[PDB]
């Protein structure tokens, strides 16, 4: 179902896409995983511990 939903758009079915380095401007010589993960933010802030 995940792969079919990916194929519903125009994304690769394998999930991994091709990423280019931001500085050197050349391709990472392996397909890497790119997606949207739901990141939280726990309140163990650095300024309350320094």
């Amino acid at each position: 179902e995940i792969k079919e939903l990916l194929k519903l758009g125009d994304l690769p079915t394998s999930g991994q896409i091709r990423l280019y380095d931001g500085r050197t401007g050349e391709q990472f010589e392996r397909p890497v995983t790119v997606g949207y993960m739901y990141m939280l933010k726990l309140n163990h802030l650095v300024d309350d511990k320094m």
Binding site: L19, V32, T33, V34, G35, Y36, M37, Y38, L40
Partner: peptide, 11 residues
């Protein structure tokens, strides 16, 4: 909704 949808990449 406890957080944000971040565009992550495992590398």
């Amino acid at each position: 909704a406890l957080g944000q949808n971040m565009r992550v990449a495992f590398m």
